[PDB]
Automatic annotation (TrEMBL), chains B, D:
Whole sequence portion shown: 183 to 243 of 1152
Name of the protein in its database record: Uncharacterized protein
Top-level division of the source organism's lineage: Viruses
Length: 61, 61, 61, 61
């Protein structure tokens, strides 16, 4: 599809982990690579998230 | 089984995407996937070195 | 207790996982059933929570 | 032990409550619990088929 409307394929297979997407420009060696891999959140990351929820609801008050 | 029940699939580290454009063929664009670790369906997938992949060039009109 | 004041029993046993509550109307076959089961949050769901927090922070700014 | 100490008890899927009113006894109301999977005290609890349970009618004055 045209570059304005091109989208990646849609997949819902549980057996595969999506690492990202590669876009190839029309008839050209150049290609755009982006990484959308699902990545873990350690307990330290989740404590940081909880801290940011605290800060949001402090700013709210 | 336990891991996939608890958390599903996720990435630990690595598996970045980089476009190199190696001239292996005039109708393909080479892409490098960096070494990483992941858990897919609970099975660990640990790769020591990068993997080269190639995407066909877009010629549809 | 009367329907305005009835509440479910209070329990703190670690060995049991609560699935829900069943309210029975006074002298009737009818019954209201609601599920309150604690459910997991995969890494994709926690990443979505992280994104929602980022959107909340951006809206706050 | 590891599972309980990391995440405690939680439901994976299923275990929805439905009211049927089957006339097995005039002094009871039938309730159906849908098939589902959960981890209780770190032990997996997989139920392939729904389980039927009955609550006694309320006659306290």
């Amino acid at each position: 599809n045209i570059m304005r409307l091109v989208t990646p394929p849609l997949n819902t297979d549980p057996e595969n982990l999506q690492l990202g997407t590669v876009t190839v420009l029309p008839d050209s060696d150049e290609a755009v690579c982006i990484s959308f891999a699902i990545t873990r959140l350690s307990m330290e990351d989740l404590q940081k998230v909880k801290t940011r929820v605290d800060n949001l609801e402090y700013n709210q008050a | 089984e336990r891991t996939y029940d608890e958390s599903g699939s996720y990435k630990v580290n690595g598996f970045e995407l980089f476009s190199e454009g190696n001239a292996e063929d005039d109708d393909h664009v080479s892409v490098v996937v960096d070494a990483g670790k992941a858990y897919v369906k609970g099975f660990k997938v640990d790769k020591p070195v990068s993997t080269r992949i190639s995407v066909p060039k877009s010629y549809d009109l």
